[PDB]
Paper text:
Herein, we identify the thiophene PF-07208254 as an allosteric [name] inhibitor with improved potency over BT2. A surface plasmon resonance (SPR)-based binding assay was developed with PF-07208254 showing good agreement between binding Kd (84 nM) and functional Ki (54 nM). The superior potency of PF-07208254 relative to BT2 may be due to improved protein contacts with non-polar side chains in the binding pocket or polarization of the sulfur electron density. Thiophene [name] inhibitors BT2 and PF-07208254 disrupted the [name] and E2 interaction as demonstrated by reduced fluorescence signal with IC50 values ± standard error (SE) of 1300 ± 290 nM (n = 26) and 56 ± 26 nM (n = 5), respectively, which were similar to their in vitro inhibition potency values.
The first committed step is BCKA decarboxylation by branched-chain ketoacid dehydrogenase (BCKDH). Branched chain ketoacid dehydrogenase (BCKDH) controls the rate limiting step in BCAA degradation, the activity of which is inhibited by BCKDH kinase ([name])-mediated phosphorylation. BCKA flux through the complex is inhibited by E1α phosphorylation (Ser337 in the full-length human protein) by branched-chain ketoacid dehydrogenase kinase ([name] or [name]). BCKDHE2 makes up the complex core, and [name] and PPM1k are thought to compete for E2 binding to regulate activity.
Residue numbers in the entry:
A (entry chain A), B (entry chain A): 26 to 47, 53 to 306, 332 to 374
């Protein structure tokens, strides 16, 4: 479509998490902003699918995701200008439907690429496509969820921004989730100890942490159980340190799971790479790093082969 | 001198720590090897001084070190071929004298460069000169000390190679040294806990660890005391983890000393850089990294601003 070609050239206007902390006229300004911003971001994704190597773009699962993005651009651009609160309520129902229609895009992309990637000349190309597609999708989802959340009245929240986020509380929520998955598979899970700036509270968007934290915790718990198959009733603790400063929030997850082997170290950050249904599909580590870098931070690993691994998640503060 | 020009072109023949684990005829073969190898390594250092920027090479302290290296090449090349045990005993006395004559070369280089570096166009140049000079000097010293040590009969030692090196024991020797320096300055020192592969024993050359370990321990202890000036009677422990695998030995030193600030992070590995007589002269960190890389390993830092720093020393095993 020619409409897609016009918007794929338009530059995306990035919204700062600080800018987001800005009658009902504010919901209209937000919906109108979204209606200008979303089609441009969708069009840049469509350009990405059009630029995929022919043999990969031809995959029926990859074609399905490409078609979904075209459909999202069509539905968003065909929506009439939002003049009043009634149009704004209709818009919310469309954004909510598109949020659900695209809930499994990461799963579908992994399936489509799984076999087709093995037929290409550039290994770096698929990593670039996934880093760009998944981080842009995360940005689209945060914008969409923020607008819908501006209608709710949660205490300590302005849309998706938590004004008093406690890292200890959000880590504990995901430790409980990971211990349950771990206990279901092994009958036992490593005890998690949290130290450092346990009392820290500050404005923050939980959404990225809601993806990254269960991933890293599942990895630390699985490694601990797999390295202690001979004593599953006596496994070492996972230790989490919170460090909070004016520049960034640092979360260190240290495990005693044997470390990442020297042979595997240069492949752990590749998509699809896994040494394994509790783990995933080899997307946890590369996706979490792309998300952290997209949000002005980083994801770094330090392997102590024979002992364990320290993972450092760094996320920039809201200004 | 023209003799220096001829040997500065000759390639150095690197001796593997494994090759070193090879009547009195073996001392002669070693002294004869040294007599061919040392002048070439000394000549490459002289070439380095000749290539220093004119304003830096002119410094009287830098000129003194340049002259010392010329003198070492002259004395080693003028020494007559070693035919017997008597010539070999005379050679040992010269190597021992040169080891003492050059004991302070790192101190003299730091002094000479301290002011003169501030008059140059290439910042990277001084780092390259120091990394190359200090690591080559370390290689010269290990060769010289190994030959002299082949005359001694220490149990568990073939020259300078320890056949059953315990990382826990060598770390404890340097923890005692650092706690004494720390207790003398503050009246108290952080307690050091050692965990991981505490029972590990393997062939290893202690000499590089004898430089790196007191440096990193002095840094961890100083940072802990400087960050707890309000409670000097209650400071947090320094935690050392030993990880031993077939490829390398990893030693992690974790402190609760507040971390390395974001402003200072990109300068801590520069020579002369210090935030400070117990510390040194800003050479500890860059020298330790150059030494670790020279020996097929690495020195990496992870800063948790507001909490502490984790330092990872990795050293390749003897094959
Ligand atoms: N804490 C850890 N300890 C040991 N191995 C780990 C750890 N974290 C990650 N790994 C390794 O990295 C591989 C890839 O990780 P990831 O991308 O998250 O996908 P998956 O969870 O599906 O295996 C894992 O299969 C595992 O071998
Ligand atoms: N463990 C640590 N914690 C905090 N700061 C550290 C640590 N290790 C090194 N540093 C910082 O790095 C700087 C440079 O270190 P170094 O090169 O070893 O020289 P020096 O010991 O003379 O200060 C120190 O002055 C200090 O600010
Ligand atoms: O890929 C996604 O996850 C999503 S969620 C969403 C909501 C919209 F309004 S468009 C859109 C897209 Cl394209
Ligand atoms: O710079 C040094 O530390 C040394 S020690 C030593 C022993 C020798 F035989 S030459 C020589 C040099 Cl050049
Ligand atoms: K992976
Ligand atoms: K320094
Ligand atoms: Mg995972
Ligand atoms: Mg030091």
């Amino acid at each position: 479509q020619s409409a897609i070609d016009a918007a794929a050239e338009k530059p995306s206007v990035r919204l700062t998490p600080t800018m987001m902390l800005y009658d009902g006229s504010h919901l209209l300004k937000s919906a109108r902003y979204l209606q200008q911003e979303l089609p441009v971001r969708i069009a840049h994704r469509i350009k990405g699918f059009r630029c995929l190597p022919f043999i990969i773009g031809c995959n029926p699962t990859i074609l399905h995701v490409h078609e979904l993005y075209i459909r999202a651009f069509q539905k968003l651009t065909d929506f009439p200008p939002i003049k009043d609160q009634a149009d704004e309520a209709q818009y919310c129902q469309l954004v909510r439907q598109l949020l659900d229609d695209h809930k499994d895009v990461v799963t579908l992309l992994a399936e489509g690429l799984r076999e087709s990637r093995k037929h290409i000349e550039d290994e770096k190309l698929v990593r670039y496509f996934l880093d760009k597609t998944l981080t842009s999708r995360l940005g689209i989802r945060m914008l969409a969820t923020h607008h819908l959340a501006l209608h709710e009245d949660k205490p300590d929240f302005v849309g998706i921004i938590c004004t008093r986020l406690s890292p200890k509380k959000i880590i504990e929520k995901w430790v409980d989730f990971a211990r349950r998955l771990c206990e279901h598979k092994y009958g036992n899970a490593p005890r998690v100890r949290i130290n450092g700036h346990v009392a820290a509270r500050f404005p923050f968007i939980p959404m990225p942490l809601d993806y990254i934290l269960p991933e890293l915790l599942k990895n630390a718990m699985r490694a601990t159980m797999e390295s202690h198959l001979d004593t599953p009733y006596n496994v070492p603790d996972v230790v989490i340190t919170i460090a909070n400063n004016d520049v960034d929030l640092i979360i260190r997850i240290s495990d005693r799971g044997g470390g990442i082997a020297h042979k595997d170290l240069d492949r752990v950050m590749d998509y699809h790479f896994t040494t394994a249904p509790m783990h995933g599909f080899g997307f946890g580590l590369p996706t979490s790093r792309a998300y952290a870098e997209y949000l002005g931070g980083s994801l770094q690993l330090q392997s102590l082969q024979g002992i364990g691994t320290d993972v450092y998640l760094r996320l920039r503060h809201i200004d």
